[model samples]
Target: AMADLEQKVLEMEASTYDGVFIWKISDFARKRQEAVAGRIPAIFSPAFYTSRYGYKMCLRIYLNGDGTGRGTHLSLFFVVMKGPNDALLRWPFNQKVTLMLLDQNNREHVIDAFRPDVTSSSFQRPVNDMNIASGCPLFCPVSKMEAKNSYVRDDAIFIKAIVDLTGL
Candidate 1:
């Protein structure tokens, strides 16, 4: 019964469709420590749709960094997941994606934006549960977040993902 309830709650959270999702990651200090200690390599956000019936996607973040950004930076990637409405959607997803590390003080947010590469398999329709992740590997420097700043406050951090919906 508890497991069933948890699944329902997760489904509810994943139903957002406003083209924007802000993930509040609490217990930042501990999570970072774990990442540095190699106890946890990455974390994922719940799947969210682009619109009520649009494409499905999610975020993958490496607290201790990954790939080229390993050890000194935070890595953030976007993943395209197979959705129920895949048949009706356009193939080879093309859109501008923006990622932001919000400032608690309401100033100087770290922003990175990019357009999907149509030729890359990462932007293709997912044949599995999800396509490979692609985005900024060197998202933000670890030291930037470690220094006295409002980026990480009260043991929490905010990450915002925005999907461009100008044409679709």
Candidate 2:
């Protein structure tokens, strides 16, 4: 809710359909925020079920339509832009900017970092590898930062995101 992901997205003119998002657990560093947010970067992994991994609580990801708790991709836009020629100007979705996820109690978890559907799909590149302040190396929380690092690998440049329902 705080990432203002959609607002930021809309301004940049990007799609957000079926984006592959992850609520991964934070484990790599003392605080996940430090890594994906600052110097150390990584990808997001799914965590919608396991106590230590996903769905430790009730949560939902909202993108284009209503928040009716019915989405298969958790987030979708993560893919459309990950293509070679996938720039925000060429987006093909309704594209919402203010992205956010919530718990049963409606507690919101704002998106931290975001990488458009580019050839790399990684913020680690840091805009010419210079850590530019223009886009998001974004605002990853300690939890999110930790989780992304846990499931991702610098070499492979991907974090297999998996979401699960807990106490079902």
Candidate 3:
């Protein structure tokens, strides 16, 4: 009964946010190349998720381990870097974040997501630079991306993040 209750609470927490992050395939390829070249730490989209009025978050994709992920998976991370809005934001954020990989079969989109383990000390606050990465090792196998399909159709791929609003 207790385990079931916890799951229900988690599901309820996931629905509280309206923010969804979408990433295009062009951007995806670009970031991967950059990571290979070691040109940058990671590639990130602007704080374009829902609530443009407040939260200044970015969607970061790391192809190889850029300190995290370690080339094991096509790692996607939510970065909470220092922003001008930090003054008004809440510290030690407890929001549940998610990520997705879209498929094009019948335009079928492949989805993958994760909820933060609050028990982990790193899940809270961004003193200088904070990063949260989630995904499966089988997310985008090299063979799959090479063979091509709806996943990388039209030079575009879609990824999304639903940030919790209540910040449980």
Candidate 4:
């Protein structure tokens, strides 16, 4: 499954709307369960390219947190990939990427947004792999407090990645 997922990410073509790159994920519950039972701490969706700058980005879900904060809450991250067309895009992603966990029962969306600190080395251009993760450490829907079926119906949930494109 990991290999197939990796291949899917490689094949993913970025998409955008009015310059914002929003990547949405479905089947949220099943993936979460899978990640916990294995060494896979997180599951990543296909990469999406921003029409605003053409830089590629991907969304990730951590059933267990990436750091020591694991088991306390679910983690979510945004990854900046090395796009083939990097030359045409801006170096060092500084745009804001918003992570969301949608509530099927309510119209209100759970939002976690981040903007890279230009001075931080984490946001610097990728040398070999992905740029450092920028997202929510405590993304919502703690399974202990709530039932999986309660928030994610039909084993489906949605996430949105909105890359800020203000000045550009």
Candidate 5:
């Protein structure tokens, strides 16, 4: 199953709004300057609380960064239960966002990672094409525990979280 997952993972592309799968663990050494080229980058997405009801919308994260970097800090993924929209994130991002892998039993292991910074919003409203349009594919506010420096390592690298809207 592990070999199958690694092979099948290549078919997944970087998302139009959040994450693209780079083909290696060592691609984190370079910097991407997409602002000059006007491209939707693969970066971070943080969740905020709504000013009205203060509910947290569930987040589905796709981390798209090189797995090999020198920093001890990596990225983590979570579901916010009911978090904020896209219009409320800060910027000046990083190059690594680490991800974790858990078994069916929910045992977590660390692996691939990258750093992400806020560049824009994640709101999906009428006539507004923020993330729905051309935004970074792997952007979302990670949980507090996942964003820390201790959650990332090279041995953990298999996580795929899927949820039906009805479940959310």
Candidate 6:
């Protein structure tokens, strides 16, 4: 129970209201090995908010990929979660989401961006703690990161998420 309580405490502390967030996953080498071996298939990021009282969400990643990208790529996804201010916010959360795998060398970052489909259930206001996750399943090729690239350095990788707040 303490571990669960600690996680809740950490989540509350790490939660952000900024429109942008960067998640740093360290010890990638071991994580990837575990993922590939099917010991751990996915990981979740601390929840973040679009604004102080806007939509709440988080990031989900499949280190060994998932669905169509399984075993060949790193799958990244966005999840919408139930927020305290959901009643005051708009339904069918429409916003552009941008995901990026940063390069430590400061060059050639792998990026994927998309506009949410209002018709999809994934974008609707969450009735639970989290809505279904939706994003790039073929985010980045695992081989590309394994190459002599700076995408992963010192067994760590940085993923940036930008919830476009254009015009608002």
TM-score of each: 0.95, 0.25, 0.63, 0.77, 0.23, 0.94
Error of 4 at 91 (Å): 2.6
TM-score for candidate 1: 0.95
lDDT of candidate model 1 versus the reference? 0.89
Q: Considering lDDT, which of the candidate structures 1 and 5 is the better prediction for this target?
A: 1
Q: What ranges in model 3 sit over 4 Å off?
A: 1-18, 27-41, 49-52, 64-72, 106-108, 119-123, 129-139
lDDT of all predictions, in order shown?
0.89, 0.28, 0.57, 0.66, 0.30, 0.91
Summarize candidate 6's per-residue lDDT along 1-168 as a digit string, tens digits: 999999999898878787798899999988998999999999999999888988889999999999999999999999999989999988889989999999899878999999999999998988888899999989999998855489888889999999998645
Residue 91 alpha-carbon offset, candidate 3, angstroms: 3.0
Residues 1-168 of candidate 4 have per-residue lDDT tens digits of 999987766655545434344444455556666666666678777667666447777777776565644666777788888777777766667887776666676666787777788876566677756777767877864663236544566756566767777654
> How should the candidates be ordered by lDDT, best one leading?
6, 1, 4, 3, 5, 2
TM-score of 4: 0.77
Model 4 poorest 10 in a row by lDDT: 16-25
Alpha-carbon RMSD to native, per candidate: 1.4, 17.2, 12.2, 3.8, 13.7, 1.3
- The lDDT leader among the candidates is 6
In model 1, which residue pairs have backbone atoms overlapping below 3 Å?
none
Candidate 1 lDDT tens digits, 1-168: 999999879977766797798888998888888999989989999888888899999999999899999999999999999988988989899989999999999879999999999999988888999999999899999988755588998888999999998668
Q: How many clashes does each candidate structure show, in the order listed? A: 0, 31, 9, 2, 36, 0
Give the lDDT of residue 42 in candidate 5: 39
lDDT of 2 by residue, 106-137 (tens): 33444433333344333222223122111222
TM-score of 2: 0.25
Error of 2 at 11 (Å): 28
Q: List the residue pairs that clash in candidate 3.
A: 21-161, 25-156, 25-157, 65-70, 65-71, 103-108, 103-109, 103-110, 104-107
